[PDB]
Design a protein around this ligand. Sequence first.
Ligand SMILES: *[C@@H]1O[C@H](CO)[C@@H](O[C@@H]2O[C@H](CO)[C@@H](O)[C@H](O)[C@H]2NC(C)=O)[C@H](O)[C@H]1NC(C)=O
Ligand SMILES: *[C@@H]1O[C@H](CO)[C@@H](O[C@@H]2O[C@H](CO)[C@@H](O)[C@H](O)[C@H]2NC(C)=O)[C@H](O)[C@H]1NC(C)=O
Ligand SMILES: *[C@@H]1O[C@H](CO)[C@@H](O)[C@H](O)[C@H]1NC(C)=O
Ligand SMILES: *[C@@H]1O[C@H](CO)[C@@H](O)[C@H](O)[C@H]1NC(C)=O
Ligand SMILES: *[C@@H]1O[C@H](CO)[C@@H](O)[C@H](O)[C@H]1NC(C)=O
Ligand SMILES: *[C@@H]1O[C@H](CO)[C@@H](O)[C@H](O)[C@H]1NC(C)=O
Ligand SMILES: *[C@@H]1O[C@H](CO)[C@@H](O)[C@H](O)[C@H]1NC(C)=O
Ligand SMILES: *[C@@H]1O[C@H](CO)[C@@H](O)[C@H](O)[C@H]1NC(C)=O
Ligand SMILES: *[C@@H]1O[C@H](CO)[C@@H](O)[C@H](O)[C@H]1NC(C)=O
Lengths: 99, 50, 254, 49, 120, 361
Amino acid sequence: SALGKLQDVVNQNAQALNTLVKQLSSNFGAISSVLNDILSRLDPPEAEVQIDRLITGRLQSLQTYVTQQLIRAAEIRASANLAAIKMSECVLGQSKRVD
Amino acid sequence: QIDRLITGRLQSLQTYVTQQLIRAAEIRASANLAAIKMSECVLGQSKRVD
Amino acid sequence: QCVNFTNRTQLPSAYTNSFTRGVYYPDKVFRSSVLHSTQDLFLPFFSNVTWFHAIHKRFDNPVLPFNDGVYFASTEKSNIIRGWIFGTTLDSKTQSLLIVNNATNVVIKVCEFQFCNYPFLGVYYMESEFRVYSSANNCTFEYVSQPFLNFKNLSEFVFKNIDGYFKIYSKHTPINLVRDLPQGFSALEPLVDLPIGINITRFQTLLALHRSGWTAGAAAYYVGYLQPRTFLLKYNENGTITDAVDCALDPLSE
Amino acid sequence: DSTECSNLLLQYGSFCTQLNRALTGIAVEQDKNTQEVFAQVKQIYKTPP
Amino acid sequence: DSTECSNLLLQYGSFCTQLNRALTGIAVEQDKNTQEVFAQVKQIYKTPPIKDFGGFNFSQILPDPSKPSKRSPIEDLLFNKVTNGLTVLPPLLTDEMIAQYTSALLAGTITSGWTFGAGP
Amino acid sequence: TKCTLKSFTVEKGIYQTSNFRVQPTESIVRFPNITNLCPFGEVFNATRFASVYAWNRKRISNCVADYSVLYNSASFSTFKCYGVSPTKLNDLCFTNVYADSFVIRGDEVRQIAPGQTGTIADYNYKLPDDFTGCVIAWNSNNLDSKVGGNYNYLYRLFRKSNLKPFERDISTEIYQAGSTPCNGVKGFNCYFPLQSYGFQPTYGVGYQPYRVVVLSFELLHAPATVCGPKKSTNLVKNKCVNFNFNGLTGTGVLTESNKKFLPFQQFGRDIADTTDAVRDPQTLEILDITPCSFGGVSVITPGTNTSNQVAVLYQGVNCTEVNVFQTRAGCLIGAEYVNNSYECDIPIGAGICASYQSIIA
Ligand SMILES: *[C@@H]1O[C@H](CO)[C@@H](O[C@@H]2O[C@H](CO)[C@@H](O)[C@H](O)[C@H]2NC(C)=O)[C@H](O)[C@H]1NC(C)=O
Ligand SMILES: *[C@@H]1O[C@H](CO)[C@@H](O[C@@H]2O[C@H](CO)[C@@H](O)[C@H](O)[C@H]2NC(C)=O)[C@H](O)[C@H]1NC(C)=O
Ligand SMILES: *[C@@H]1O[C@H](CO)[C@@H](O)[C@H](O)[C@H]1NC(C)=O
Ligand SMILES: *[C@@H]1O[C@H](CO)[C@@H](O)[C@H](O)[C@H]1NC(C)=O
Ligand SMILES: *[C@@H]1O[C@H](CO)[C@@H](O)[C@H](O)[C@H]1NC(C)=O
Ligand SMILES: *[C@@H]1O[C@H](CO)[C@@H](O)[C@H](O)[C@H]1NC(C)=O
Ligand SMILES: *[C@@H]1O[C@H](CO)[C@@H](O)[C@H](O)[C@H]1NC(C)=O
Ligand SMILES: *[C@@H]1O[C@H](CO)[C@@H](O)[C@H](O)[C@H]1NC(C)=O
Ligand SMILES: *[C@@H]1O[C@H](CO)[C@@H](O)[C@H](O)[C@H]1NC(C)=O
């Protein structure tokens, strides 16, 4: 568990990708989660409604994924800014700052 | 009708979680600053101005 | 022809532990080196499974409910157990399912059989005795296939009836344990899918007599009932289920 | 406590798991923040009488 | 690949452009972060062939010539101990170049102290 | 790039402008091998047929029924299908098939139809109005007629009431046309129900014997198992094709697989529940399904003030699937690799950078 911070970031990113891929299997209230099944089983007046339900569900999932990706990007950017400050002040000089 | 209630409540809950995450990031930044101040002002004497 | 068995010895049926048996493949999909969570009609781990004996004078053929599904385990030697009866009323009023495994082949018939109270097969010391039903009037489905089959052989079967589909799962295990179910894990492969499309609430075990009255060969079987629950299955590099977790058994497995 | 509502809610997938996981991450993050700020000494020092 | 789905998706506007732009910004931000952390020297410093540092041993942190990856034993241990329209873009700086940057920083701080961070 | 950036001047850099998709080329529809044919030889090619009254009924279940062999035969005079068309019989699937076989006259073939009237429909063989199936009839003057007269085929001439659909009457009880009881003797007003057709070869075409097989197709709430055979388009590997294996459809590149399936398993899924392995139903071999290549299309250019030369990067796409150079980032077209190392001007990725001096990478 020495390298838990990097493994934590890798696991969070992989878990977000796995959840985003898994969200395609959900129908979001439609008859099926497969577009081909809806297009082959229903007439276009009701297939348009079913495809619209799938589109809004998948778009909500993608927007949610992008939102947590942006939040994690901000957190990683803050950590990287801290790492650059530590590289400048601890490696390239001697720091009087305690701890 | 239940589907309309579900989508409205789910949108509300996702919105609440989104601002909770943003406030969590802000509080985490403030706590990191507080930890730096605890290390450098309390546990030592700091030459950093202000 | 029907024959009443009047030489039985009265004894209560036993109960024992299921351990980690009764797991079957939920679908026909290959999965390798993965952990898959599935919600299906499964047999709970460490459950109370009913134990019936055939020893001499015990001959256990009671009337048992089917419920959502039946796990049937058999610690068998010398081939006494021959088949099963499924139905609701077990007469000509409703339509019933017959599965038999005689000396040559396995026969599945869906007919309105007028069943005997004590249906049985017989071996003379060759098979020359068959007393299961007195009539068969309306037959819709027939399926003839290959033979499916100290206690030396363990046969596990799972019978389910969902959406007009009769799923039979089977597994054959070489064992050398004397009296009870061995403790271990063995995933049941799917054996057959039958389009019977009939209502089933009651089932019967079919046995075979030994004649040289009658004598019952040494055999033992176990009946368990399926419940809807979630399992976490582990697939190895060769696609074989090697371990399982009951999601609702205890907080550790949860 | 509506069973029908939960059955319809299951069609949307793992949104609830995502929200619970995010809230759990925030909840453990608060404790981590308190550890980082206040638990910087492993010796409990005391003043003289 | 559904044409009807894309035709219905065009009714919602430029949501897809927003999501792609945000992901592109994150992707360039990661490379900017790696540049900010590791690319702080414009000179690639190297250690002398004779490792006479007055008794100080830096073999566990200097790059190993025997390894093809040109990593330190500590860095090699660190790399060993970490294990539908989606694409993964490679990082701009590869692992060997990042290791080369760390090697340059190590050589600068060993042979020159803090002088290389403030000038020549 | 100008279209994407909404500007007529493009600053120096790399801009992701489009996407590339290897479009599918063929459709591969592999279903299982044609085995277990339905016993149509024992119905049509029978050595003797039954009479119209005691008409033979054979129930056909759990096999593969190839109806195109019957439709494309030239030996049948009537192939009139009611309630279904012959072209989709070889596609559709039914729970059971009822094959009724009998012999009637030439002029009596028209009465084997929904909504008709006559002696055969009223007293011998009645078809329902809601009938789905086919009536196949052919001349059998060669087999069923002899020079002395063939009296083996009979028909019920009378009965008190009309038959129900798919009813068989084999009773030999004396018809009572009058008030007086017959008492088993064919006297006055009391006649015998079954009358023979004295089939002779020299008869007219409206009186010659015709063998009729009526196939009745019903759909019941049980799963339909008597399915017509499907075909197998020649498998194409190493190309982006649309695959349909046993009802599982998709688009992908089908390559050889080293995964050893268990005999009961047909498809393969990864962690993310996507189908990445499959078993061919015709030949028991395992095929990997690699998704068809998709990638970002990025344009690498200097300023339009400097030059109009551009390079195209296909991200994560091999160069054989699109001044062509292969990078770890993808395939770069329009730039030439130089062994020299310079400062990074336009970032490509994986240590690769581009610059203008022509465009070099
Ligand atoms: C074997 O025993 C069973 C039960 O004792 C007999 O079934 C009974 O048959 C009688 C017919 O007179 C019915 O009135 C009872 O209701 C039946 N009981 C049950 C539980 O089914 C069966 O007939 C016996 N077999 C023979 C051949 O006599
Ligand atoms: C610096 O430290 C390294 C490692 O601690 C020393 O390398 C060891 O040398 C001895 C004697 O030659 C070997 O038996 C060990 O197996 C070496 N260890 C490793 C990890 O290679 C090295 O000798 C030390 N001194 C100098 C001047 O480099
Ligand atoms: C099984 O059930 C019987 C009665 O039904 C009971 O006596 C026995 O204790 C049970 N066994 C277990 C392990 O619960
Ligand atoms: C087994 O049953 C089948 C079907 O009834 C029959 O054809 C066969 O002869 C039987 N075999 C023996 C040995 O009785
Ligand atoms: C079942 O059989 C009885 C008599 O054998 C018959 O009257 C009835 O119509 C039959 N039902 C079906 C559905 O075949
Ligand atoms: C099946 O039979 C049981 C009892 O005979 C009855 O309660 C149930 O409703 C039946 N189900 C169907 C689908 O007929
Ligand atoms: C998997 O199969 C290989 C042979 O292909 C065998 O060597 C290996 O031991 C098997 N692994 C397990 C866990 O059965
Ligand atoms: C029946 O006989 C005809 C004529 O001899 C022949 O062409 C046909 O192949 C036979 N079989 C079937 C199934 O029609
Ligand atoms: C399928 O039929 C072909 C001949 O068309 C044969 O070569 C092949 O072995 C068969 N496969 C199976 C699994 O029966």
